[PDB]
């Protein structure tokens, strides 16, 4: 997933693109929540479905 770009305008025409894995999507926003009575697979499933 594209996340950043760089470009040198003066003479040298160079544009640098940067992309990251989808885990970057899971690390974007800080959350406050609570989980009770859920297995690791269930918690991961809910988080991925989000």
């Amino acid at each position: 997933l594209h996340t950043g770009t760089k470009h040198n305008a003066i003479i040298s025409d160079t544009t640098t693109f940067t992309g990251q894995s989808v885990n970057w999507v899971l690390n974007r926003r800080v959350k406050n929540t609570r989980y009770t009575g859920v297995t690791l697979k269930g918690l991961a499933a809910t988080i991925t479905r989000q």
Binding site: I11, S12, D13, T14
Partner: protein, 281 residues
């Protein structure tokens, strides 16, 4: 040969008349290049007198001009050619080598000439602030080279009298520089503004002066007292207050009425340098 030359390009060249005198080249101050001999004898205390900085005793046998033009290469993998991008044009380097200085028979010292040429490295103190050395022009007959600066100089002395050089070879190199703008920095901005080629922001191309502000206040008061009866009630009732003033912006020229409280009340019009333009009906 003269049988293989292209006469089409030859005949397109200017024809030069032979001078009636043998000519010697010289180095002169720039801006002093178009000055004639203002005096019979050079006066060192005054400037722009049209006298050469250094007079050649013998002319060069040959002069070399070099010009590199700088492109930048970008090597994209798996392409037949590089990508050439123009960077800059570069400066012309002039070189004259094996210049002759000979006064052995005259028994005259060359040291003053060597000192004169060497003194071109020293910073020329201007007002009291050390500045860059003299900017030169190499003049030969009716031809000039450019605004140039002495970059390298070397002497090879082979004969002396009492330790004073009398026969020397001189190699020197000049470099063409950007032509200094004779136009003043403020004049350049003013003529940029006159042609309206600069950015505009609603300001006048000339900030009003204090005398201009006084005169604009005079004109506004004249117009207001002449046209008081046609002003809206909300303007004449604030003009009836003796505690109301007229203020003109220095950069935009907008005229404003300030009530007794001292706050902005209404916009009356605009004032440039010469005329007062009242607001639309």
């Amino acid at each position: 040969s003269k049988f293989l030359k292209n006469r089409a390009v030859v005949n397109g060249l200017p024809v030069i008349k032979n001078p009636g005198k043998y000519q010697h080249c010289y180095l002169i101050e720039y801006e002093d290049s178009t000055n004639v001999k203002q005096t019979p004898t050079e006066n060192k205390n005054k400037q722009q007198q049209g006298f050469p900085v250094y007079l050649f005793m013998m002319n060069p046998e040959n002069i070399t001009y070099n010009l590199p033009i700088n492109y930048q290469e970008i090597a994209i993998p798996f392409t037949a050619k590089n990508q050439l991008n123009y960077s800059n044009g570069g400066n012309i380097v002039m070189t004259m080598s094996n210049l002759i200085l000979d006064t052995m028979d005259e028994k005259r010292s060359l040291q003053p000439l060597i000192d004169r040429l060497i003194a071109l490295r020293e910073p020329t103190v201007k007002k009291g602030l050390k500045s860059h050395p003299k900017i030169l022009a190499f003049k030969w007959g009716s031809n000039t080279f450019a605004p140039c600066v002495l970059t390298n100089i070397s002497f090879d002395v082979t004969r002396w009298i009492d330790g004073y050089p009398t026969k020397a070879r001189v190699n020197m190199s000049l470099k063409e520089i950007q032509k200094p703008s004779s136009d003043s920095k403020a004049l350049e901005e003013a003529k940029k503004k006159v042609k309206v080629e600069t950015v505009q922001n609603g300001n006048l191309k000339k900030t009003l002066s204090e005398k201009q502000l006084i005169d604009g206040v005079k004109r506004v008061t004249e117009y207001l007292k002449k046209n008081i009866s046609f002003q809206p009630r909300t303007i004449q009732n604030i003009l009836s207050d003796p505690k109301s003033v007229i203020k003109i912006d220095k950069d935009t020229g907008q005229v404003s009425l300030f009530n007794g409280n001292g706050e902005f009340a209404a916009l009356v019009g605009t004032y440039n340098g010469d005329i007062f333009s009242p607001s639309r009906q």
